[PDB]
Amino acid sequence: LQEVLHMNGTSYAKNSSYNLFLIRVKPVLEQCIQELLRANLPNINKCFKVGDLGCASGPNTFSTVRDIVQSIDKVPTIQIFLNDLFQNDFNSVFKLLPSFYRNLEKENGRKIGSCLIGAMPGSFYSRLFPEESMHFLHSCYCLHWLSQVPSGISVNKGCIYSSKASRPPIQKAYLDQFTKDFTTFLRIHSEELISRGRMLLTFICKEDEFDHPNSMDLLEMSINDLVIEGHLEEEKLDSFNVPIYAPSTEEVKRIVEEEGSFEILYLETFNAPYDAGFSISPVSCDEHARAAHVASVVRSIYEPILASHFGEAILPDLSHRIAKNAAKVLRSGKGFYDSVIISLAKKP
Amino acid sequence: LQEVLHMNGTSYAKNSSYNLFLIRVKPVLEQCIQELLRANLPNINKCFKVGDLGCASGPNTFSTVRDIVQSIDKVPTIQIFLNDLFQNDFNSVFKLLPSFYRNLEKENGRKIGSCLIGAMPGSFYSRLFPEESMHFLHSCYCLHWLSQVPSGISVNKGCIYSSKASRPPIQKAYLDQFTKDFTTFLRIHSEELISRGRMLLTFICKEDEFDHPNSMDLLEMSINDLVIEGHLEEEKLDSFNVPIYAPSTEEVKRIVEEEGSFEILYLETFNAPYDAGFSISPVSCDEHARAAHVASVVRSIYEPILASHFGEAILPDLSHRIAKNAAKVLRSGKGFYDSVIISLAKKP
Ligand SMILES: Nc1ncnc2c1ncn2[C@@H]1O[C@H](CSCC[C@H](N)C(=O)O)[C@@H](O)[C@H]1O
Ligand SMILES: Nc1ncnc2c1ncn2[C@@H]1O[C@H](CSCC[C@H](N)C(=O)O)[C@@H](O)[C@H]1O
Ligand SMILES: Cn1cnc2c1c(=O)[nH]c(=O)n2C
Numbered sequence: 127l128q129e130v131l132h133m134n135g136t137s138y139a140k141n142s143s144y145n146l147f148l149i150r151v152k153p154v155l156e157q158c159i160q161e162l163l164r165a166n167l168p169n170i171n172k173c174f175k176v177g178d179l180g181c182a183s184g185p186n187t188f189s190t191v192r193d194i195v196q197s198i199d200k201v202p203t204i205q206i207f208l209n210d211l212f213q214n215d216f217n218s219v220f221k222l223l224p225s226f227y228r229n230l231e232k233e234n235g236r237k238i239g240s241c242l243i244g245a246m247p248g249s250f251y252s253r254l255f256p257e258e259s260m261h262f263l264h265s266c267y268c269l270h271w272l273s274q275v276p277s278g279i280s281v282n283k284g285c286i287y288s289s290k291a292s293r294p295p296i297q298k299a300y301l302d303q304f305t306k307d308f309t310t311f312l313r314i315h316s317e318e319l320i321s322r323g324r325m326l327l328t329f330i331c332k333e334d335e336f337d338h339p340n341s342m343d344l345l346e347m348s349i350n351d352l353v354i355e356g357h358l359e360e361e362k363l364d365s366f367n368v369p370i371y372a373p374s375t376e377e378v379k380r381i382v383e384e385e386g387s388f389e390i391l392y393l394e395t396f397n398a399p400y401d402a403g404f405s406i407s408p409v410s411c412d413e414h415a416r417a418a419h420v421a422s423v424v425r426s427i428y429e430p431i432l433a434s435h436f437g438e439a440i441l442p443d444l445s446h447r448i449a450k451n452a453a454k455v456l457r458s459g460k461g462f463y464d465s466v467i468i469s470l471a472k473k474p
Numbered sequence: 475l476q477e478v479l480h481m482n483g484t485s486y487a488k489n490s491s492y493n494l495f496l497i498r499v500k501p502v503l504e505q506c507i508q509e510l511l512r513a514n515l516p517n518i519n520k521c522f523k524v525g526d527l528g529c530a531s532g533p534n535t536f537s538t539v540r541d542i543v544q545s546i547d548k549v550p551t552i553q554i555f556l557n558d559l560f561q562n563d564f565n566s567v568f569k570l571l572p573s574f575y576r577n578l579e580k581e582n583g584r585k586i587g588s589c590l591i592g593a594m595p596g597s598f599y600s601r602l603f604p605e606e607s608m609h610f611l612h613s614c615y616c617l618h619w620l621s622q623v624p625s626g627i628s629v630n631k632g633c634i635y636s637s638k639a640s641r642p643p644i645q646k647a648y649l650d651q652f653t654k655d656f657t658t659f660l661r662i663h664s665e666e667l668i669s670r671g672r673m674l675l676t677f678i679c680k681e682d683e684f685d686h687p688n689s690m691d692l693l694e695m696s697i698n699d700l701v702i703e704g705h706l707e708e709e710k711l712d713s714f715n716v717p718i719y720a721p722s723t724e725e726v727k728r729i730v731e732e733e734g735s736f737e738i739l740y741l742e743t744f745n746a747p748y749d750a751g752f753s754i755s756p757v758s759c760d761e762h763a764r765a766a767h768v769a770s771v772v773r774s775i776y777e778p779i780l781a782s783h784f785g786e787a788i789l790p791d792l793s794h795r796i797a798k799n800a801a802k803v804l805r806s807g808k809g810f811y812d813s814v815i816i817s818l819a820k821k822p
């Protein structure tokens with residue numbers, strides 16, 4: 127998937143929003159960075175070296191950089207490495223850099239050349255940076271993507287991942303894959319961090335106490351509609367497996383403590399409404415448009431993988447079922463994407 | 475030009491060749507890198523940090539990385555930053571990285587993750603890297619490009635740059651621009667280098683003793699043909715000025731010594747035949763094809779700037795005149811691109 131997985135190049139950019147997860151991350155990001163400067167890590171007041179792991183493209187890429195930069199300058203050279211898979215749309219980010227830099231100088235006074243933005247492409251499940259070279263690593267909404275479909279060909283009937291309705295051997299196969307992946311992530315990136323360096327990670331979580339469908343759940347139920355309706359053969363659904371896990375906070379916690387590289391400074395979950403990134407009639411129109419927006423966001427996350435497995439002909443039917451499902455969920459008051467945020471410091 | 479200048483995205487890749495300049499650079503590159511390891515710069519045996527300034531795209535980008543990597547490993551983590559202007563075709567380099575990395579491991583044994591290739595886009599006339607962070611900076615065939623058209627609207631009649639036929643106020647305007655630009659280059663990048671760090675630079679030079687037309691000279695004479703022939707109004711030629719200088723070695727030497735940041739370790743010129751990158755009938759066919767190749771290479775360097783000034787309609791006529799001119803030059807035995815190579819060490 128290293129050379130297959132990426133967000134939609136409509137686009138992830140057009141459908142993304144600061145208002146979904148990044149605004150919840152921001153205060154925690156801010157506190158993390160301020161604590162780092164106060165900790166006086168070697169060279170941090172000369173050059174603050176930061177990586178954004180799974181930056182994608184679009185406004186969110188720039189919004190995350192802005193948040194970092196403003197956090198650092200809140201009342202040092204900044205070297206930012208943007209990381210994503212080798213077929214991410216880097217060219218478009220780089221073309222927006224000249225205006226980004228000017229706007230940075232008009233906004234903050236940050237002289238041009240004092241914030242140095244480059245890219246380091248590759249999988250965050252492999253080494254990206256020299257040993258003990260980085261102060262801070264940030265990733266938002268990436269770590270639920272696995273390095274591969276769980277290494278357990280086997281039939282996950284009526285399901286596309288370890289959903290609540292999936293059988294326990296599937297659930298165990300997906301957990302074991304996440305464990306491998308996340309342990310590797312932690313082992314590798316701890317080595318890249320300067321002593322007492324930090325990571326701030328935000329990704330999908332599963333909460334036993336709630337019952338809120340995540341984007342994969344909305345997708346799964348919508349593919350199911352289509353087989354029931356007759357539009358898709360049951361074999362297409364039975365063969366489709368997404369390389370994505372939704373962990374519990376206890377699972378996240380056990381993995382980190384097992385790895386041993388990091389102390390947990392902060393660990394919380396939060397629930398983001400589906401349409402938090404949506405802006406504005408009767409009211410059936412209002413809710414139609416909100417549901418249609420949700421479906422666009424969900425299509426923008428999964429289209430590459432959906433097109434390779436199913437072909438392009440079912441995607442408009444799929445978008446239609448996702449919207450219908452989205453609206454029913456929001457009406458029941460369970461229309462939230464559940465997310466965990468965890469702040470880690472490298473142990474001496 | 476920071477946001478306008480770039481090589482042709484036919485393409486610079488298809489028309490480029492290791493055999494033109496890089497094979498001449500290679501032995502000097504090799505000696506430079508070996509001397510660096512022996513000098514024991516801080517951290518160099520942990521992580522060797524290298525920048526390629528004006529990497530472009532195509533085989534040459536990868537050939538330069540390969541040469542660096544093989545030089546380092548000749549009987550350490552390697553972090554390579556590829557730099558070019560913000561609208562360079564980075565996406566295509568990154569997409570070739572997965573196979574590059576595998577081929578690196580099949581060739582050398584270089585484990586994956588021990589050579590870390592990223593990008594730092596921007597003008598090399600501004601800061602690219604944190605202070606005292608780099609061991610070695612390499613640039614081949616870039617530094618003759620100026621930051622702007624010489625800051626001397628004024629009419630350069632019948633000429634496109636400071637050619638031998640250009641009047642002395644033009645020559646002085648172009649030299650003064652190169653002086654500003656190259657001095658800035660040196661001041662800025664010296665600051666980025668770790669103590670006793672080095673630069674290896676290769677670019678076009680002008681030699682009083684020879685009389686060999688460079689690619690701009692071939693272009694200039696070919697645009698002149700077209701005005702004489704009637705295909706182009708003299709005003710189009712009189713208004714066209716390329717942001718490019720061809721310095722003498724004495725001019726290069728004076729600038730470096732004036733700047734004061736660098737000691738010169740090595741300084742030589744070499745003359746590269748026009749068709750050194752060309753592979754294979756009577757013989758008028760052979761020489762036709764060799765001349766046509768030269769014209770393609772010349773079009774691939776200048777098409778973006780030619781299209782913006784002249785429009786697209788004259789380019790096939792232009793390619794035809796460049797080939798005719800190329801063949802006459804080669805036949806006289808003066809068909810060489812004259813180049814200088816200079817090795818610099820940061821003074822204590
Ligand atoms: N192993 C991996 N290495 C690098 N990037 C990965 C990855 N697995 C998933 N991703 C990236 O994770 C991103 C998820 S979308 C999140 C993007 C950004 N952090 C934001 O807030 O909008 C995608 O761009 C995808 O390509
Ligand atoms: N100010 C500048 N900053 C960064 N790159 C520049 C530049 N001025 C010119 N260049 C780059 O110089 C390159 C010249 S072609 C040389 C490319 C490569 N070194 C090789 O051996 O093939 C172009 O890609 C162009 O975009
Ligand atoms: C709702 N939403 C918004 N962005 C995302 C999601 C998601 O569910 N998974 C996911 O991977 N990403 C990037």
Ligand SMILES: Cn1cnc2c1c(=O)[nH]c(=O)n2C
Nearest residue numbers: 615616678688689690775811
């Ligand atoms: C002959 N040749 C091959 N490559 C180049 C040239 C040149 O003349 N200028 C120039 O800038 N570049 C990149």
